[PDB]
Structure 1
Amino acid sequence: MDKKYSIGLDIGTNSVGWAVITDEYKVPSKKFKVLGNTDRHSIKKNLIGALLFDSGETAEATRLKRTARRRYTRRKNRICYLQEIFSNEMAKVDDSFFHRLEESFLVEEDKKHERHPIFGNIVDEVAYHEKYPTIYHLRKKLVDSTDKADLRLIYLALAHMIKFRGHFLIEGDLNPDNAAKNLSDAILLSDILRVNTEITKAPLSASMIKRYDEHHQDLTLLKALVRQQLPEKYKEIFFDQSKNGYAGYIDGGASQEEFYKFIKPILEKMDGTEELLVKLNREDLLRKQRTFDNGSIPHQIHLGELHAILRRQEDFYPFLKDNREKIEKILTFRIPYYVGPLARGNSRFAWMTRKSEETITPWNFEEVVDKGASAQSFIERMTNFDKNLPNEKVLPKHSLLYEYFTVYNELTKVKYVTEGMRKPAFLSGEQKKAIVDLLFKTNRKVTVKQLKEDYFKKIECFDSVEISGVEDRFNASLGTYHDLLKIIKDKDFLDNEENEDILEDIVLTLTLFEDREMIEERLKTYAHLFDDKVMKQLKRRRYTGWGRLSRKLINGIRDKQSGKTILDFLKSDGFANRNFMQLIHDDSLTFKEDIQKAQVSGQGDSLHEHIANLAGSPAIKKGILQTVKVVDELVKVMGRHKPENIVIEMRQITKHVAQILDSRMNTKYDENDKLIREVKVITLKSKLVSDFRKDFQFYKVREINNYHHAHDAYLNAVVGTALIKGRDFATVRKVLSMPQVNIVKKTEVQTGGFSKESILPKRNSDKLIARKKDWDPKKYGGFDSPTVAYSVLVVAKVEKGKSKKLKSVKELLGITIMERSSFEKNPIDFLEAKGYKEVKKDLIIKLPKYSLFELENGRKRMLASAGELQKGNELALPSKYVNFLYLASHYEKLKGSPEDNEQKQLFVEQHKHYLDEIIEQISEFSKRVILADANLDKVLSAYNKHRDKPIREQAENIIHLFTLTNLGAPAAFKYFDTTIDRKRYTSTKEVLDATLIHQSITGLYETRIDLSQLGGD
């Protein structure tokens, strides 16, 4: 006999509750086989549980970092282009200059050439640094001086300008000397560059030099004043790097804001600090040259300085004169946003169409990359396909055909009432055409009043007309038709159906592109039909937005019997006058049959595909996938007999989950090709279950344990079955008080960044990771704290001691994400590289994160990483304590009748002895499985100290207390005024003799491996 049963589900962002109920609301318990090498061959478990997993993440960070990588690569490419241009002449002046620049990061020992990068001799380096303290002095010198300068300094200036060329937020050419545009540019440049009194061709360099000079003067003044009045604080301000003083502001990591915050109170304590304080209020005291404000500098200033240098120094160096435009274009060029990556087919993010297989360089970008086709592909891929015809692209919203479709569809259901007419009548096709020609082609917006006054009253000679279905105006508007009539000024050209394709292409071109040059290029094909004025006016009009119906759907598909399209039927359909919905749903026409052919159901469709097609944050998609797998495994458990009812609650996403479950469950088709719905998919709202809990006193407290998800799923199923359909309440209370609930933490292999992104200074440690292959961390520093992908149990021998003696060992080794590929390629070589010898390959066990181990007395631990464990046991608290805690916590916030509130208050007051019982149970559970003796003693002392506090405060602080025994990583908590630090389990040796547990997604199937029998001494 097949036992009828129903499955309840609770879907969240982090958990998926599942419960199996029979027709009598009982939860059956079955005896399951256990595999492995342990003696426990059979375990009895209840059919209720919850699944827990880490939340899914969005793709934002990956996109940001990928874009950053591309920017860095292209900047390096610009530098390489400049060096390639200069190489031939730099060979004659100083051959090894570029090698010195390239290897400057290395220490003195590892450098191949002389250590000084610029000149290679100390006297010239010192002279250069004295004459040009900052690069801006060199830039101004090269801008103004007419003397022949050393080519190396010219390269330094040009590279400095190219590498930091500035933003591109302003198009066109900008006048640095600043109609109303001149003033708008002048106030704009006022903040960018401040005060250029003496005439200088390069203003930015002059401003930076002014800032440096003011910095020097103010620093000298501050030193003098501090030394005169406050001798004791001189060392603190100018020597101590760990403070926020000037020493920390320059040689330390202190920011400008912190430096000002520290220095302001001291300045007020000294005399003669009026100017310094005024500057400090302006954020201009002792300011650096390289600050975060420079983000507002337009690239035109740098371009002007570059051009000035190239003009000044061209007479001495012939190669600069020939390559001036190349150097300028290196700075000015960027890849247009619609072009995308310049990938050669081998990138999934690419859409560029390349004309010739040459290498794309800034000097020949125009000749190689098809810009117009690239823009078309950029704007076409994102647009949604037509639902009725999945293989056809949708039309633009402002397309003429779309507007005609809307007008004819709206006029289809218009009813008019005249004198002598017993019933409202539909407008005929001739009437619709006449109305369109008279008003819709003459008025941008046509109102019901205008229609009645103009067409019925004047043409049809009807004095009184009543119209239904349209409210004071028609929504459809022929705005595009009016715009084209205004521009082209040819009514016959617009009214000719032979010109439909040309107008459609013109509208599509206007919608697709936003650069005027591309629009001009594509419209050039139709320049023979229009004059120059019409052509230029067309290039100015722009439309935005896309429609929902394709051209093939409206005017492309033709009925086999009649030959009319949907648009044609809307124009005239006889007495039927069927709208778009009726036309597509009419069985008498081939339209319905063609549409039914058009939809294709997924034949062997992958579930992940349809889930990815859904809309929403990826976390809910992960939850949906987990829910579906849970349902599949539950069906597998019950003998593959599909359940009668499925109740879910979480609303389009919920309906999508419902459709997925319906499609997977109900598949058999009857003799009439109709779906045989053996399984009913049910959607409920959590308000019903919440009211059910509040009415029948099934209170839940989320801070106690994780059983609440399973209880919510069980209540969902019970409520759904009861609604759609003493003993029942007793059964419910028995079920909700069960101690055994299957909680499973989904094991996941960690992925992501290799380690933390902060680069740390050099230090004698073996835990620093090199930034490059040849960069020893003891000399150059590097990254730290790699994230372990997964741990592997290793049984081998290690040479220990100074004598290098072989000792048999058994320990957990953590594989970092960086080494995952190398380890999976050949585990033996990787293990040998770490010093392990005589490795037994068959004993390598893959242990992902949150692997569950069992210990004595039922104590359980989950493997958080190679060196830290997490609590793995759930506290089973009797329901009466949960109810008392809920009632006491909301003691002053109960929402109900006064009699019920008084009854709850009395019940709280009478059972005050429950507090000591709760404390005792917490202590017993902690002593059994937590082993937090010091923290437990602190908790007990704090409870004893505050034993006279009001009941509500006691309950509120006790609710916080269950953080100690909660599943997962330990967390700190506050109990009254005393703070308890977290107890971390920083040793993994105890699990080397534990019983490893492998659990299926529901936890019903187990495979227990006892590691104590592996790798004995």
Structure 2
Amino acid sequence: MDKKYSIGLDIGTNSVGWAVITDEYKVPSKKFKVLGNTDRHSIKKNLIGALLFDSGETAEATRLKRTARRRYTRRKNRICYLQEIFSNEMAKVDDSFFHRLEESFLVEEDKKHERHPIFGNIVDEVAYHEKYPTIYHLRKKLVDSTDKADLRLIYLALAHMIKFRGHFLIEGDLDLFLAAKNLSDAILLSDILRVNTEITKAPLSASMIKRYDEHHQDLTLLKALVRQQLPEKYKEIFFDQSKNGYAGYIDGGASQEEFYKFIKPILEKMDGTEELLVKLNREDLLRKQRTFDNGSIPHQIHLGELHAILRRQEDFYPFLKDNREKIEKILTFRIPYYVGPLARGNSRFAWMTRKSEETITPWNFEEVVDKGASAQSFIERMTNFDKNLPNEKVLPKHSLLYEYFTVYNELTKVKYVTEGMRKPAFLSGEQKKAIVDLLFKTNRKVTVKQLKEDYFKKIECFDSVEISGVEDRFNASLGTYHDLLKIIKDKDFLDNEENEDILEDIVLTLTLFEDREMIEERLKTYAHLFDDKVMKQLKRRRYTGWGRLSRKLINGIRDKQSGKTILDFLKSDGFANRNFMQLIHDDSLTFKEDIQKAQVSGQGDSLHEHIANLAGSPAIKKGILQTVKVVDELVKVMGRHKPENIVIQITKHVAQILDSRMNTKYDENDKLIREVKVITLKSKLVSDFRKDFQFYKVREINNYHHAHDAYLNAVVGTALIKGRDFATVRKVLSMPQVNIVKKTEVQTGGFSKESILPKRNSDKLIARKKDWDPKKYGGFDSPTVAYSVLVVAKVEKGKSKKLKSVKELLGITIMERSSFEKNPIDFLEAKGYKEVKKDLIIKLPKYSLFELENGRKRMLASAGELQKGNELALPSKYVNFLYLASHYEKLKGSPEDNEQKQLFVEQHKHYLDEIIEQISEFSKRVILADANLDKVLSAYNKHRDKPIREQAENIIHLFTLTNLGAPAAFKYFDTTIDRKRYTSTKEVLDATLIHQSITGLYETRIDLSQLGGD
């Protein structure tokens, strides 16, 4: 007997509740065979459970990482281009200059040359540092000096500018409103440049040097004043780097805001601080040359600086003068945003098409790459296809034929009522055409009043007319027609249908391209039809937007019997006056058949693909995929006998997918047979049912709430479509044996944390490069654990290197995953493991589960940390009492019910002791947090006289201790409780390892104690 059964769903962002109920709303239970080497061969379990899992994440951070990687690569490539250009002359004076530059980061031991990067000697380095303390001094020198400078300094300055080229936010080259914008640019410069009157072509360097001089004088005055007046804090401010004083501001991690906050109260006390106070108010005190306010610098300033430097220095180095165009290109070149990555097809994010196959350089970009076809594919690859014509691209928003369609379709169902008319009448084709010609071609917008005055009364001589269908004014407008009438000024050309193709082509050309030159190039085919001024003004007009329909749909196909296009039908359709929607579904015409032929019998959509094809967060994609997997697994459990019904814009997608997978058989009339019906509901009804019948939901006690919500969803839906039931549900809610499963997942992402810590002496430092000793250069810390593997072997230990049989878990970082998978044995031996027993290697992902004595459970969080693996079960009556006490002062309802609930809360106050005792018993038995538990016990008797509502609310805080997963710290009234972290994983090495199905119904237990038995 295939028992009638249904499956309900309660889908959340991280939670997917499932439950199967019979016609009596009862969840049955079955005995499941257990595989493995353990004595427990079969466990009976209830057909209810849920899956908790990590939230899905969007690739936005990954996209930022990719963009940053491209930024770094292209900046380095610019450096390489400059270095190659400078290479030829560099060899004559200093061949090791570029050799010194690349290897400066190395220690003196690792340097193959002298440690000084600039000159390779100390005396000249000191002289250079003395003459030009900052790079801005060198920049101002080069901008102002006419003298021939060393090429090394020139290269350094140019590389500095190139590496910090600045923003391209202002285009071009830098009446009354025009003078106003010039003054705005002057204000921008004054923000950038603080030297207003100096005769210089590079005011930015002057501004930086003036800032440095102010910093010097301010520091001198401040040190003098502090020494004179507050000697005790001298060493604190100026020597103690750990504080937010000057030492921390410059040498430590203290920033500008921190420095100002630290120094303001101190400056409030000494003499002569008025200027210092104002400077702090203007944020001009001791300003660094590298802040976050330099981001407003136009790249045109850097271009001018380069141009001036080259202008001054071209007289002595002819190769600089002859390569000035290339250097200016390197500084100025920006990859067009419509082109894309310069890949040879092998990059999944590349769309560029090449004219030739040479190496792309900033000097030969355009001639090698078809920017026209590049933008053509760029726009096209991101547009959509018509649903009725899957193989056709959509027309632009402002297509003239599209406007014709819109105007005619809006005018189609216009009903007019005049004197003597018993019923409203439709507009004839002649009437509609006359209306369009008289008003729409003359008015950018047409209202009801305008129509009544201009056509009904002036033309058809109807003194009184009633208009229906549109309230105020007609939405469709021939705005593009008005613009083309304004520009072309040839109404006969515009109204000639022989020009329809040309007009549509021009509109598409205007829509596709944003660059003026390409638009002019493509439209030059029509230069013989229009004058020069029209061509110029056409080069100026632009539009945006894309519609939903293609040219083929409206004017491409024709009816077999009549041959009228959709435009023809909308112009006049007889007395039927069928609009677009009516026309495309009428059986009397062949348009529907044309759409069906256009509809391609598509391949069975991959479940991975279709979920990846819906619009939404990837998190809901993961949730839906897991839910479908759960559905399939549950069906497979029941002998593949399909259920009756399912109760659940994600909902409709779930419904369609479930119907597609379940209902696949077609009847004698080729109609899909729906043996399973999808039932759609929302949370409001179920919450109302809960509040009506005291089935209260608490989201802090345990995770049984998800499964209970799914169970209620199914019950309510089945009852809706279709005493004892209340009691059955109550028994269901109190059932402790509930399948709670955390999805095991192999961790991905970054190799380690992003903080680069200073050098130390420990084995945990991770080298940033292959040839870089961590103790010499520091590196990363806290690598991310990929998963764990069980190893039973012998390891040499102690001074004597005595091999000792061991049984331990080694943490695999994500970075070394490939090396481990390539050859596990060699990778283990590289770590010193010997006599590896490969047959016993078990791969354990994160959240691996372990069974210990008395049912105590732990989840493998990482290599050396565990998580609580047990769930707190509480009786229903206590949950109801806690709910009533929690909302005791927030009751919203009839006063009688509120007073009854208050009396019930007062009567059973003694439940508090039972709750505390049960929590303490659970803690002692499975949690082992004796100190924190005793703290809680002391706190309970401390505040036993407190108001009941606060007591219950702070007890709700206590369930944080029994929460599954990572332990967390929480506060109880005035008592703070810290988190209990289990740092020892040795005990689970002899525990019971269980592997469960994604629903946990199928399971396999492996006893780790038996493995590696001596």
TM range (shorter): over 0.9
Q: 1:196 deviation in Å?
A: 2.9
Q: Which whole-Å deviations, capped at 9, do the CAs of 1:298-318 have from their partners, x for residues lacking one? A: 111111111111111111111
Q: Deviations over 1:287-334 (max 9, x none)?
A: 111111100111111111111111111111111110111111111111
**Is residue 176–residue 301 contact of structure 1 (8 Å, CA) maintained in 2?**
no
- Deviations for 1:890-926, whole angstroms, at most 9, x for unmatched residues? 1111112111111111111111111111111111111
8 A contact 2:793–2:835 mirrored in 1? yes
Q: 1:692 to 1:177 in 2, by over 3 A?
A: closer
Compare 596-605 and 371-380 and name the one that shifted more.
596-605
Q: For residue 547 of structure 1, give the secondary structure of its aligned residue in structure 2.
A: coil
Deviation readout 1:616-643 (Å, 9 max, x if unpaired)? 2111121111111111111111221111
Q: Is 1:817 aligned to residue 811 of structure 2?
A: no
Structure 1 position 666, deviation (Å): 1.3
Aligned to 1:534: 534
Match for residue 866 of structure 1 among 855, 863, 867: 863
- For the residue of structure 2 that corresponds to 1:115, the secondary structure is coil
Q: Is 1:769–1:784's contact at 8 Å kept on the other side of the alignment?
A: yes
Contact 1:50 1:709 in 2 (8 A): yes
Contact (CA 8 Å) 1:178, 1:186: kept in 2 or not?
Answer: no
SS at the partner of 1:1013? Answer: coil
Measured against aligned partners, the alpha-carbon deviations of 1:951-1003 in whole angstroms (never above 9, x if no partner) come to 11110111110110111100000011111111111111111111111111111
Q: TM-score, normalised by structure 2?
A: 0.98
CA deviations on 1:851-892 (whole Å, 9 max, x unpaired) are: 111111011111111111101111110000000000001111
Cα distance change on mapping 1:175 and 1:814 into 2, 3 Å: farther
Q: 1:175 to 1:995 in 2, by over 3 A?
A: farther
Q: Which piece of structure 1 moves more, 968-977 or 453-462?
A: 453-462
- SS where residue 670 of structure 2 aligns? coil
Residues in 2 aligned to 1:600 and 1:32: alpha-carbon distance in whole angstroms: 45
| Map of 2:934 onto structure 1 | 937
- Tell me, in whole angstroms, the C-alpha distance in 2 between the residues paired with 1:445 and 1:9: 51
The question of whether the paired residues in 1 share the 8 Å contact of 2:388 and 2:598 is answered with yes
Cα distance in 2 for residues equivalent to 1:176 and 1:126: 53
**Matched residue SS, 2:811:** strand
CA contact (8 A) 2:195 2:210 kept: no
Q: Are 1:704 and 2:688 counterparts?
A: no
Deviation at 1:673? 1.1
The answer for the alignment partner of 1:424 in structure 2 is 424
Are the aligned partners of 1:789 and 1:814 in contact in 2 as well (CA < 8 Å)? yes
Deviations along 1:546-572, one digit per CA (max 9) or x if unpaired, are 111111111112222222222221112
Structure 2 distance, partners of 1:452, 1:227, is: 90
Contact 1:615–1:653 (8 Å) recurs in 2: no
Alignment of 1:74 with 2:74, yes or no, is yes
Aligned-pair RMSD on alpha carbons? Answer: 1.7
Using the TM superposition, give the Cα deviation of residue 388 of structure 1 relative to its aligned residue in structure 2, in angstroms.
1.5
1:602: how far off? 4.5
In structure 2, the CA distance between the partners of 1:601 and 1:245, relative to structure 1 (3 Å rule), is farther
State the distance in 2 between where 1:826 and 1:351 align. 38
Which of 459-468 and 706-715 deviates more? 459-468
Identity of aligned residues (%): 100
Distance change >3 Å, CA 157–CA 476, structure 1 → 2: same
SS of 1:10's partner is strand
Of residues 836, 839, 856 in structure 1, which corresponds to 2:836?
A: 839
Contact 2:9 2:18 in 1 (8 A): yes
Give the corresponding residue for 2:758. 761
Greater CA drift, 55-64 or 446-455: 446-455
Q: Please state how far the C-alpha of 1:741 moved relative to its aligned partner.
A: 0.6
**How many angstroms does 1:929 deviate by?**
0.8
> Equivalent of 1:742, from 735, 739, 742?
739
Retained in 1: the 8 A contact 2:850–2:858? yes
Check 1:423–1:176 CA distance in 2 against 1; reply closer, same or farther (3 A cut).
closer
In the TM superposition, what is the alpha-carbon distance from 1:175 to its structure 2 partner? 17
Per-residue CA deviations over 1:473-508 (Å, capped at 9, x if unaligned) read: 211111111111111111122122222222112111
- Distance, in Å, in 2 between the alignment partners of 1:953 and 1:67 is 51
- Deviation string for 1:154-203 (max 9, x for gaps)? 11111111111111111011199994442232222221212332312210
- Supply the distance in 1 between the matched residues of 2:426 and 2:902 (Cα, whole angstroms): 69
> Contact conserved, 1:343 with 1:352, CA < 8 A, in 2?
yes
Contact 1:747–1:849 (CA under 8 A) maintained in structure 2: yes
**Partners of 2:820 and 2:272 in 1: how far apart?**
68
> For structure 2, which runs of at least 5 residues remain unmatched after alignment?
none
In structure 2, C-alpha distance between the alignment counterparts of 1:954 and 1:390, rounded to whole Å: 64
SS in 2 for 1:549: coil
* Alpha carbons 2:193, 2:206 under 8 Å: kept: no
What is aligned with 1:332?
A: 332
Q: Secondary structure at the match of 2:961?
A: coil
Secondary structure of the structure 1 residue equivalent to 2:438: helix
Partner of residue 443, structure 1: 443
SS in 2 for 1:161: helix
Task: Provide the C-alpha distance between the structure 1 equivalents of 2:561 and 2:777, rounded to a whole number of angstroms.
Answer: 81
With 568-577 and 631-640 compared, the bigger mean Cα shift is at 568-577
**Distance in 1 separating the partners of 2:669 and 2:177:** 83
1:180 aligns with 2:177: no
The structural deviation recorded for 1:524 is: 2.0
1:701 counterpart SS class:
coil
Q: How far apart, CA to CA, are the structure 2 residues paired with 1:867 and 1:319?
A: 62
Q: Do 1:196 and 1:206's aligned partners in 2 also have CA atoms closer than 8 Å?
A: no
Please give the per-residue CA displacement for 1:189-223, whole angstroms capped at 9, x wherever unaligned: 22121233231221011111111111111111111
SS of match in other structure, 2:746:
coil
Partner of 1:45: 45
Residues 33 and 41 in structure 2, CA contact (< 8 A), matched pair in contact too: yes
1:179 and 1:278 map into 2 onto residues whose CA distance is 32
Deviation at 1:418, TM superposition (A): 3.1
Moved more, 385-394 or 996-1005: 385-394
Does the 8 Å CA contact 2:174/2:300 hold for their aligned counterparts?
A: yes
Q: Deviations for 1:602-622, whole angstroms, at most 9, x for unmatched residues?
A: 532111211122122111121
Superposed displacement of residue 1009, structure 1: 1.0
**TM-fit CA distance, 1:372:** 2.0
CA distance in 2, matches of 1:923, 1:206: 72
**Normalising to structure 1: TM-score of the pair?**
0.98
Count of residue pairs the alignment pairs up: 1014
Deviations 1:562-606 (A, max 9, x none): 222222211122222211111111111111122223334653211
DSSP 3-state at the match of 1:684? coil
- After TM superposition, give the deviation of residue 686 of structure 1 in Å: 0.8
Tell me, in whole angstroms, the C-alpha distance in 1 between the residues paired with 2:166 and 2:467: 63
The separation in 1 between residues aligned to 2:985 and 2:566, in whole angstroms, is: 72
Single out whichever of 664-673 and 493-502 deviates more from structure 2: 493-502
Map 1:609-688; keep pairs closer than 5 Å: 609-648=609-648, 652-688=649-685
Structure 1 residues 177 and 567, CA gap change in structure 2 (3 angstroms): closer
Of 425-434 and 484-493, the range deviating more from structure 2: 425-434
Deviation string 1:324-363 (CA, Å, 9 cap, x unpaired) is 1111111111111111211221111111222111111111
Between stretches 590-599 and 929-938, larger displacement belongs to 590-599
How far off its partner does 1:404 sit? 0.5
Shift of 1:51: 0.9
Question: Structure 1 residues 828, 890: CA separation in 2 closer, same or farther (over 3 Å shift)?
Answer: same
When residues 420 and 281 of structure 1 are mapped into structure 2, their CA distance, relative to the original with a 3 A threshold, is closer
Residues 10, 16 of structure 1: 8 Å contact kept: yes
Distance 2:180 2:47 in 1: 78
Shift of 1:472: 3.0
**Aligned partners of 1:476, 1:175: CA distance in 2, in Å?**
39
| Distance 1:623-1:901 versus aligned 2 partners, 3 A rule | same
Query: Using a 3 Å threshold, how does the CA distance of structure 1 residues 294 and 464 change in structure 2: closer, same or farther?
Result: same
1:148 Cα deviation (Å)?
1.1
1:529-557 Cα offsets, whole Å, 9 max, x none, are: 21111011111111111111111111112
Q: Is the 8 A contact 2:21 2:28 kept in 1?
A: yes
Tell me the CA shift for residue 283 of structure 1: 0.6
Aligned to 2:381: 381
Residue 756 of structure 1 contacts residue 786 of structure 1 at CA under 8 Å; is this kept in 2? yes
Distance 1:456 1:901 in 2: 67
Deviation at 1:470, TM superposition (A): 2.1
Matches within 5 A, 1:77-116: 77-116=77-116
Spell out, residue by residue over 1:22-55, the C-alpha distance to the aligned partner (whole angstroms, 9 max, x if none).
0011111111111111111111111111111110
Q: CA deviation at 1:376?
A: 2.3
Q: Give, in whole Å, the separation in 2 of the partners of 1:880 and 1:486.
A: 79
Which region of structure 1 is more displaced relative to structure 2, 940-949 or 458-467? 458-467
Q: Secondary structure at the match of 2:1004?
A: strand
**CA pair 534-612 structure 1, distance change in 2 beyond 3 A:** same
Q: CA offset at residue 143 of structure 1?
A: 1.0
Q: Which moved more, 1:446-455 or 1:582-591?
A: 446-455
